[model samples]
Target: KETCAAKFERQHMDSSTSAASSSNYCNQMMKSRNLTKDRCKPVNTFVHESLADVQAVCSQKNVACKNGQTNCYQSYSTMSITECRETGSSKYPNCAYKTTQANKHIIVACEGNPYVPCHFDASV
Candidate 1:
């Protein structure tokens, strides 16, 4: 069974490509990661930080998630990230995306015995 931490890594972590120069980064990445298989995800963010750094956020002060859950935590330092937004004309199985890169304090929801990021909540 895939743990939430594993799923989060697959969906949000992108440590190697610290700086994506190509606009197609999101288009190709979203598809390659299988996020665009069933439907075009309206929005998604990819963090350029290492897994260890991101995992440490679980120990940071807690904050309420967008859905009102209290498992979320905000990173103490801003990190590089890329946001993918589906194009207006994007369609399922043929997804298209626009990538925007920035540095921001990430918010994530954590869970499990050895607590780890389970979801990418938002960026501040």
Candidate 2:
């Protein structure tokens, strides 16, 4: 029973990273961040940027959601991000991922009272 904004925060925000350079970063983080519950989330992003910067994206120009909605917006700047892609042999309880870092313009879906981010659509 997670709210949309809360779900978005959990899946996409990670401001702390003492050491995420290891190959196991995605594998470790995908679980540590609670994305392992129920089933492994096939793909996700962890933004290194601050909450303020992320929330500010709401004011950005609008775009169409990849999942066919009209609530998306793109960031005005390239943000530091890590993408976690599920490994080919990934399965529940032993889900694995490949981690990669990149700087890209992010796309997010925003909604609700006062208007805030509800989903992370893409980072590119």
Candidate 3:
């Protein structure tokens, strides 16, 4: 609902606070290990019925990209499966974590199935 910066501020990350500075730290912590979209301007609107769907629909271990004791930044995408388009977009991206430990991997998905619009929450 709020930016990493905002959440950081609220969490008392400011210099006056311990975690205030963590706000501007960036959600995509792993710059060297980017999991960005290879393509631009994908088509379908991303809609999520609830936050639970955003997390549980896919296996956390798979989405989070865990490897033994290591953790990874992973993302997934699905097409709109409603047989119709929402907000004129069919592609959606999802990520597991903001950062990851070494040896872990980030799973990037583009919702390969055309029949499914790939429901997702934009705030996701």
Candidate 4:
């Protein structure tokens, strides 16, 4: 809870107002936002929402989110975010992402097979 992402998360979760606030309505289970635009580039997008498998960074790379999350692609060579969903989560606590993140995870409906885990990394 020391970074902007973590800070926002700490505030929203501690307040329990992810989706109940007037200025920032985060949800009980904050959904993943689409990152097909500014702010969230592919690698940075996961930090916004809650990506589970960001190139073997699952579990350890967790965040507060609706369904936690997992992204997938055909091979590891594709660029655009094909599709995304709030598939799985991390623990039994409160969950919530951000609109800054939620608006992005919604735009990745893929090409090839979209039934795979998100194979992306900040080091790719």
Best by TM-score: 1
lDDT of each: 0.91, 0.87, 0.26, 0.28
Which candidate should be chosen as best, given lDDT against the real structure?
1
Candidate 4 per-residue C-alpha lDDT over 31-118 given as tens digits, one digit per residue, 9 for 90 to 100:
3332322332212222232332222233232333333343322223222221222224422243323323232222221112323223
lDDT of 1 by residue, 8-115 (tens): 999999999786669999998899888987789889999998899999999986899999989999998899999999999988878999999999999999999899
In each prediction, how many residue pairs overlap at the backbone (N, C-alpha, C within less than 3 A)?
A: 0, 0, 21, 27
Candidate 2 per-residue C-alpha lDDT over 30-56 given as tens digits, one digit per residue, 9 for 90 to 100: 998899888988998888888888999
TM-score ranking from best candidate downward: 1, 2, 3, 4
- Give RMSD to native, each candidate: 1.0, 1.6, 17.2, 15.6
| Cα lDDT for residue 2, candidate 4 | 54
In terms of TM-score, which candidate is stronger, 1 or 4?
1
Candidate 3 accuracy as TM-score = 0.19
Q: Cα deviation of 104 in candidate 3 (Å)?
A: 26
Which parts of model 1 have CA positions greater than 4 angstroms off? none
| Segments of candidate 4 deviating more than 4 angstroms | 1-24, 28-92, 96-98, 101-109, 112-124
TM-score of each: 0.96, 0.91, 0.19, 0.17
TM-score of 4: 0.17
Question: Candidate 4 lDDT (Cα, whole model)?
Answer: 0.28
